[PDB]
């Protein structure tokens, strides 16, 4: 039921990409505050300036045919993001060591900032194209632990949670442009015989291989956590109440970090 738990209380068996010689650095760390100094231990991006890509391979292949597919995992920008990203992908097979921006995957999720501009992004790779998430929600601006948490059911509905809360809730085929259009002409009542219908918006046209986070960071710092995927929603909002709803003391840890300045 819960296929994949990545508590990065290691990073040995993530694999880091060769597409380029100067890929930023990792380790295992719980950052400058934090609310547990081991279970808050998460994989954490160190230099500024610097693109990462490292992935790691599912035990077993995943798979979501008439079952729900969920994905959580966390990151903490404690360093004062202005430009970075902080999301996540899946992928069909690949080779780790050429994975990069290009890479094929099925689906890009997390959080992205730069300047201004900010949203979570759910990108769904469907019918050779990747399709952006048409609603923009905004994540945090602070420095604190926010889990991002994605079911795809096998109705075709999904939804997003942020810190466990649900956002975002709808239909694939009306919240992306995955299909053709049902009318010829809006509004018109006139239907579209073009028109092809996909019970399997939802499913993976591949198995699903690989997990790998391919961000590009100008202020770095960054740490993720608990890269949880299941076919099971509450299952794994339960593990997110364990591991992250760590909430009460990471908060007071960092006021404490807050009242020194
Ligand atoms: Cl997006």
């Given at each position: 039921?819960?296929?994949?738990?990545?508590?990065?209380?290691?990073?040995?068996?993530?694999?880091?990409?060769?597409?380029?010689?100067?890929?930023?650095?990792?380790?295992?760390?719980?950052?400058?505050?934090?609310?547990?100094?081991?279970?808050?231990?998460?994989?954490?991006?160190?230099?500024?300036?610097?693109?990462?890509?490292?992935?790691?391979?599912?035990?077993?292949?995943?798979?979501?045919?008439?079952?729900?597919?969920?994905?959580?995992?966390?990151?903490?920008?404690?360093?004062?993001?202005?430009?970075?990203?902080?999301?996540?992908?899946?992928?069909?097979?690949?080779?780790?060591?050429?994975?990069?921006?290009?890479?094929?995957?099925?689906?890009?999720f997390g959080p992205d900032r730069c300047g201004?501009?900010?949203?979570?992004?759910?990108?769904?790779?469907?019918?050779?194209?990747?399709?952006?998430?048409?609603?923009?929600?905004?994540?945090?601006?602070?420095?604190?632990?926010?889990?991002?948490?994605?079911?795809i059911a096998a109705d075709n509905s999904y939804?997003?949670?942020?810190?466990?809360?649900?956002?975002?809730?709808?239909?694939?085929?009306?919240?992306?442009?995955?299909?053709?259009?049902?009318?010829?002409?809006?509004?018109?009542?006139?239907?579209?015989?073009?028109?092809?219908?996909?019970?399997?918006?939802?499913?993976?046209?591949?198995?699903?291989?690989?997990?790998?986070?391919?961000?590009?960071?100008?202020?770095?710092?960054?740490?993720?956590?608990?890269?949880?995927?299941?076919?099971?929603?509450?299952?794994?909002?339960?593990?997110?109440?364990?591991?992250?709803?760590?909430?009460?003391?990471?908060?007071?840890?960092?006021?404490?970090?807050?009242?020194?300045?």
């Open positions: 039921t819960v296929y994949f738990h990545e508590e990065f209380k290691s990073m040995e068996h993530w694999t880091t990409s060769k597409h380029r010689d100067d890929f930023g650095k990792v380790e295992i760390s719980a950052g400058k505050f934090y609310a547990d100094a081991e279970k808050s231990k998460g994989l954490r991006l160190t230099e500024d300036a610097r693109f990462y890509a490292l992935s790691t391979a599912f035990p077993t292949p995943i798979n979501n045919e008439k079952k729900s597919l969920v994905v959580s995992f966390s990151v903490k920008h404690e360093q004062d993001l202005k430009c970075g990203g902080g999301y996540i992908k899946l992928l069909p097979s690949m080779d780790p060591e050429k994975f990069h921006g290009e890479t094929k995957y099925w689906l890009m201004s501009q900010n949203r979570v992004h759910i990108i769904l790779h469907y019918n050779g194209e990747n399709r952006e998430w048409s609603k923009r929600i905004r994540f945090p601006e602070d420095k604190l632990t926010h889990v991002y948490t994605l079911h939804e997003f949670f942020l810190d466990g809360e649900s956002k975002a809730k709808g239909q694939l085929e009306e919240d992306w442009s995955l299909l053709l259009p049902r009318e010829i002409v809006d509004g018109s009542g006139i239907p579209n015989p073009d028109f092809v219908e996909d019970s399997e918006l939802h499913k993976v046209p591949e198995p699903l291989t690989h997990v790998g986070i391919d961000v590009w960071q100008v202020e770095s710092g960054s740490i993720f956590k608990d890269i949880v995927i299941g076919d099971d929603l509450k299952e794994v909002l339960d593990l997110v109440e364990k591991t992250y709803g760590l909430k009460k003391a990471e908060a007071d840890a960092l006021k404490v970090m807050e009242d020194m300045e």
